[PDB]
Amino acid sequence: MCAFHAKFKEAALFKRVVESLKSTIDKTNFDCSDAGIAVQCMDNSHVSLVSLLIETDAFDEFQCLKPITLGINLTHLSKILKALDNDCGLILDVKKVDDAVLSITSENKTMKFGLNLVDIEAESVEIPELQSDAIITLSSAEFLKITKDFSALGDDSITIGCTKNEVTLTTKGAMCETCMTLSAGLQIEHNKDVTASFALKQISEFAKSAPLADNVKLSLSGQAPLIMEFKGEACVLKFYLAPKF
Amino acid sequence: MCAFHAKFKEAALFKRVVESLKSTIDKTNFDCSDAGIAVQCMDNSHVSLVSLLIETDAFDEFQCLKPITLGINLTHLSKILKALDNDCGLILDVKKVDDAVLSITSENKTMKFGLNLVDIEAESVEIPELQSDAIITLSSAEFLKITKDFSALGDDSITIGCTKNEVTLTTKGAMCETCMTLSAGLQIEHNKDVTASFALKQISEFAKSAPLADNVKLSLSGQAPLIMEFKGEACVLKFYLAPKF
Amino acid sequence: MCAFHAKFKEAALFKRVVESLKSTIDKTNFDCSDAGIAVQCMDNSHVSLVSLLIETDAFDEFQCLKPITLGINLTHLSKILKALDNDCGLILDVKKVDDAVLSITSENKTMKFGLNLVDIEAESVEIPELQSDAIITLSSAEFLKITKDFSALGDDSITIGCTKNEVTLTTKGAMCETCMTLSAGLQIEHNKDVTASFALKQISEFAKSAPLADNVKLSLSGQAPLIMEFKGEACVLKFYLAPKF
Predict the structure, then answer these.
(1) What region holds the Proliferating cell nuclear antigen PCNA N-terminal domain (chains A, B, C) (predicted)?
(2) DSSP structure class, residue A117
(3) Residue A25: which CATH number?
């Protein structure tokens, strides 16, 4: 009997998950259980927090009787996933504790990969407590564009401000001071004006998770970590980043 | 009161201007006045002449009461312009003599950039006197293709010859002798047969200005500098290059 | 009188030939005769055999009264051919023994290139004798995709197995064991089950000849060299590769 078996409803979902993930962390544990697939760990720089939950509703078949944790090198997994089509039937299998995750594409073709698992020795982490001043919702693709321009024209920080009707995004580089202003497409749930600065490298790497969801949700606080959430079908991805001062 | 204010009819125009420009010169003065925006200077190699004139008809709004000269690093300006859409409403502002040109994109979005101006110490230049033997008009995109193939297959020179009904373009490389022949699409205003050789690096860099205009106009003389003109809507770009011997 | 004159029915044919060729060999002799254009030589690594035959049916005009051999640097020829459109009228000419092959594109444009020929001192080679166990036919583009994924995920070998109804392709890399399985699109002419390993570098370089033909034909034997054939209109390309043990 297999310790773990899972077939996705959509192969695109897990490919997109792994891209988004691998921009911010290289090796990570996938904690599987009868409740789904989870990832909670710090980014590469030990500066921020990543939180993934794929739910059982994302799969056509799902079996994980007892919890297991798969140590996964995301560079190796994306290389495998890049070989697949969004069309295919993607299946994951773990036989026992023999250290290999079997990925399977079904088509008149079938591809089977044995991915060697890794040993990841990592302290489990806990999300911070928050009560945000404003919650911003915006096209994730437009938000990505912005992070992109900012990386080119900015320095190390990006400032994000929110008022009742407008969001403001600021960076100042060596040869340029930039300011994008959005007015409510864009949704603002506001209860208190708020502005904060963040590491642009993180924001801009986080922003690349756009493929997971049409919109991105930024939960904004002046002193406590921001949340950038990409909620998909039966799946959600979140990043936690503390403001800079 | 602002020393300079300008809003383009089309944002594409100024983006295209700056690309074309920056292929042949890195930093240059933009001389603004109530007559428009002008650039007259030598290329990077001090081998040729660039001549730009954007007229006031290219703008929906234009104010420049007294002449000013903006010292502009084109590498920095293109990076800013690349962030904009051809769609947007592009505005330029100079407050006073505080050394920053404000670019503004209007969309439910607005982007404001402060570009630091530079000090450019350059002798003003004068265009040469000409009376050309033939004036050739041809798709600028087909002319670019040719410069491109020639750069790959040729050496340092390109020869351009004109007769009553045909234009001839020649380069000879280490492993190849190449010859393109065009017959009159292509227009020839001819009064005297003429052939001359030119630095291929220049021609091929000049040719990249194709986006400014559907056709390119080459004014050809045997002993005096060639003209390569890209005339847009209310705008024109010209290069002056002396033949080699 | 020209020693050799040829105009292709389709310019795409010779461009595709030269790309496919140049992936496996850099300089080679083109043996022309009244029977067509032929190339028989070992790959760069002196590990495999290339066999090309363009027939006279591939041309609208063809004259080669006496056999000639053109020593051709394929890097230089592809650079020339890349300048042409699939649309154009491609002509080859050799005047005498003056060491230049004239390529000509006819359009209101005409391009003439003189390509310097080379001296290639190579022992003529002979194809091996075969009687294959199975002959597999499959989309050449799907076969290329596979070689591509395998190069990324595999090591130095690829294993190809054939049964009555299924083909099996295996490679095992440092972090991955991969297996694609195809079932009969795909055609199998089978008389004996067969499996063999091959240098993946070769297969994957050979596979890039896909543009020549919709399908690829692999003639498979357990001990004797495999054949990978790309048969076009009036043209055919073949590679011969011995199994590894």
Answers:
(1) 4-123
(2) P
(3) 3.70.10.10
